Design a protein around this ligand. Structure first.
Ligand code: 5LD
Ligand code: 5LD
Ligand code: 5LD
Ligand code: 5LD
Ligand code: 5LD
Ligand code: 5LD
Ligand code: MN
Ligand code: MN
Ligand code: MN
Ligand code: MN
Ligand code: MN
Ligand code: MN
Ligand code: MN
Ligand code: MN
Ligand code: MN
Ligand code: MN
Ligand code: MN
Ligand code: MN
Lengths: 185, 185, 185, 185, 185, 185
């Protein structure tokens, strides 16, 4: 079960491929290094094999090369799934880091939606603009065709809240499409 | 594992049977057609085989023929279970529709309770009186002997909130009694 | 410039075709008659030729046969456009009815968004559920791939506010894609 | 998989052993009888085999013999686990009693934390000082090395809230370390 | 219709030329790269041919080399126009990006004014100081001799609000001076 | 009295050694230079001999290489102490910088706790993320096994508040364990 999408514009050049049924292998180098620590989380905890290579204009702000990565993961994930048959289709999970809880629920059925209730106190994490985290999941929703609710329940630390939502999105994505129920189709 | 209850009063005539271990088959025609769309949800997502035939006085308000359907599903579900042995007994699940989250938790152990926190903005959905949804689960609780907490977390659409709680009740009922733990009894 | 989409599920059967460059001709019969008065407005004021034939389950609530009409207009409108070249791409317009102003702005470039600020006082217009008007434009946005801002500026009348936003959406859709600028491509 | 810890000070004398992979057997007599009803819950619902023998100074307040029990369960649970390999590592669960919901989430990875949001109305349950329940889980966190979030969602009954958090901690501890994912190590 | 202004002080060295009647060609390299992405917008959407070469002291803050660019565009734009005859003279436009609306209105008649109602949440975009955007249009107003009202109507994203006002200023500047009415002079 | 801890993970490589009874000598180079100015303060004012060598991934945010330094100082400090005998065990001190008072109290007896009441106005000091100062003392508490209360009493300057708490922690750590009372053991 693999979907691979290449996509190149005048701003970015994005190469994306995902094995949906796989192991904790990860090779994914974007132009900004903080996404590389977050795409490790949906490889080791979601047990996906994700491969991202993106070259973009970080000479200017990082908004352009974060859209085109997140848009390409969704088109690869819509192409990874087929005619949706024999999957659980519902993924819900909550995951603590230190002091912080995120609850992530998702639907993976045609219709795109993003509910976003996180509030990050600081404006940069290391060098990541921190207003792009909602824009990562907004771009992932619009091409994958999924409903997604992300809710913060506790916690005040910028590196801890963003890493609690990428562990909880990974565990709730391998519960929806990766696992299978008792029915056949 | 089947329980079947017939029940007839001067107002209604209700025939109800449930296969608790079954597939996504559904034949259930009540006097009001909007329940028929909701009992489809606890057949396809709960993987139950539910059979409801009710004839009642919809010449007057629909309050009378909604009690006697919901009372008969519970007596059939108490008769579907036996001496409760080797079941998980706890069912919790949250399920998104577009913009709306419902969290449903349940207990299935003797004691009846209903906590209800939904707030529906409109007063009719198509023709369904919308004040009967809490009364559906109040009648189902009192005969099944279960604790039930239903909590709205987001969402403003009458057809979306009621369909998000009948998908989440179904997935949380096939987690409590249908699945079995590692112990035998 | 024509796009035609047929779409049939277990609930509805929808046939939709749009001439984007056309005249004020209109033949469009949905299962609910109040949409037929509103699709007249995007034919005579938008100068589109829209043809809708939908058969659906109005035996239950009208939510199901309003999605599948609005989803099919968008896929027809994405197929009416091609590689977007030589269009204005921006459509903004405000249109009064009696006492009521709606301001509609749109983008037609890939990314879907809906901003909705209307507040209708009553719950039915004639028989139309009135909570579906936002759901009409939510379904039209997700398949057409357009940003859409709809803002109420004045007015308290249910038939006047909904008819002021379907005149202003029509005039702002024939300004974006139908008219052409001085450039060639 | 067994860890056994003996620990004796001038105040208490505590003997603690836990089979982490086991059945619903329970023999655990502390000096105060209300802990004995609560350690039954993490034996039958968590499917652990816990053995506690503690003799302490209940001639004075029960604060001293509740620390040393809860400190010894954690050191036994850190010794029950080894090099943490091939476990789910995340345990989240919510469990109703009558009218009361507790949501318990946990992490079991090195770092200790306790978030506590319960509010018990009365000051004694039978004879248990009721300000020690947070101190039970504070002592269990500091030696086990786990993050733990405990959140009350409803309910006003002292015996019902404390028994809803010891059923939900047990089900969320046999989900984190007891169950195993599809990966090997 | 071309105006070209060279201007050099002890701090900056600015070379600016604008073809007002032209096409979507753009070669404009300032010392800070985020202006280069914004001056692309008034070339492709305004259909102007703008040429900016500025060398300045970005060894210190960027306030000095943003004034002298914006002051030189206005003197070039006052020299691009002549005795104002046969132009529309009024330019108003609103332009959505994702979630954000800016309404820009302008006058181009002698008298300088700037109304500014934007509120940007963050303090840097990539490396641009974000308090200079109002100072860009304040310097452009004082030399061009135009009234300018900029009003935010929605939106919370720093890169989206600033790019929605440079698309709407461009479309409202090619409506005022570039297009011509039915009168001759 | 020396404890030395080496610790290496996939992210960092930390070498830490502390002479608890020593002089004002300091050689400690972490990957981020602002910790090096703060570990000078617990060498000259605490009269400790601390040696830290850490190599970590400052290619991404500094959160990872600040945990593993602070975790290694605590394990070295627990190994510096032995069976705690003949020490004062209580350390309390308040220390002014310009306009700012911090009161630091500590316990060094088994049980870990951190109370943190500082509020820093800015978000970076030079390049240090400033949300990590509480996370420094949270990691130092969990491995050393000490209670620690840090309270701000006055002051508004980011470099002055953080340097007032590292002078007051040093003087309160050489009062607890370094000095000895009149008793022998
Ligand atoms: O969760 P872990 O312990 O497996 C490693 C984390 O990814 C690193 N971390 C520590 N604090 C925040 N992130
Ligand atoms: O959830 P689906 O997409 O399987 C079909 C829904 O039952 C129909 N629906 C669409 N909006 C509200 N209900
Ligand atoms: O706008 P008109 O006058 O062309 C006809 C309207 O469509 C009918 N109407 C009158 N009030 C509300 N709608
Ligand atoms: O939950 P049960 O019914 O298995 C027995 C309970 O432990 C006893 N109880 C009844 N109310 C509060 N506790
Ligand atoms: O508006 P577009 O899609 O033509 C390209 C934008 O300029 C890039 N962008 C995407 N988000 C914010 N800016
Ligand atoms: O406290 P001092 O004067 O010994 C030197 C300080 O460490 C340097 N300093 C001056 N302001 C803030 N820090
Ligand atoms: Mn964007
Ligand atoms: Mn991390
Ligand atoms: Mn009743
Ligand atoms: Mn439905
Ligand atoms: Mn819908
Ligand atoms: Mn009308
Ligand atoms: Mn205590
Ligand atoms: Mn009890
Ligand atoms: Mn200035
Ligand atoms: Mn841009
Ligand atoms: Mn951390
Ligand atoms: Mn200093």
């Amino acid at each position: 079960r693999i979907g691979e999408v290449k996509r190149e514009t005048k701003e970015t050049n994005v190469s994306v491929k995902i094995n949906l049924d796989g192991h904790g292998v990860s090779d994914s180098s974007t132009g900004i290094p903080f996404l590389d620590h977050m795409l490790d989380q949906l490889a080791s905890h979601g047990l996906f094999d994700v491969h991202v290579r993106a070259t973009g204009d970080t000479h200017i702000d990082d908004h352009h090369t974060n859209e085109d990565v997140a848009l390409a993961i969704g088109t690869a994930l819509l192409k990874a799934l087929g005619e949706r048959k024999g999957i659980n289709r519902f993924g819900d999970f909550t995951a603590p880091l230190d002091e912080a809880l995120i609850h992530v629920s998702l639907d993976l059925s045609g219709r795109p939606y993003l509910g976003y209730n996180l509030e990050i106190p600081t404006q940069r994490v290391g060098t990541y603009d921190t207003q792009l985290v909602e824009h990562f999941f907004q771009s992932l929703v619009n091409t994958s065709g999924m409903t997604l609710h992300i809710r913060q329940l506790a916690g005040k630390n910028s590196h801890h809240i963003i890493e609690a939502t990428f562990k909880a999105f990974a565990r709730a994505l391998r519960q929806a499409t990766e696992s299978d129920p008792r029915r056949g189709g």
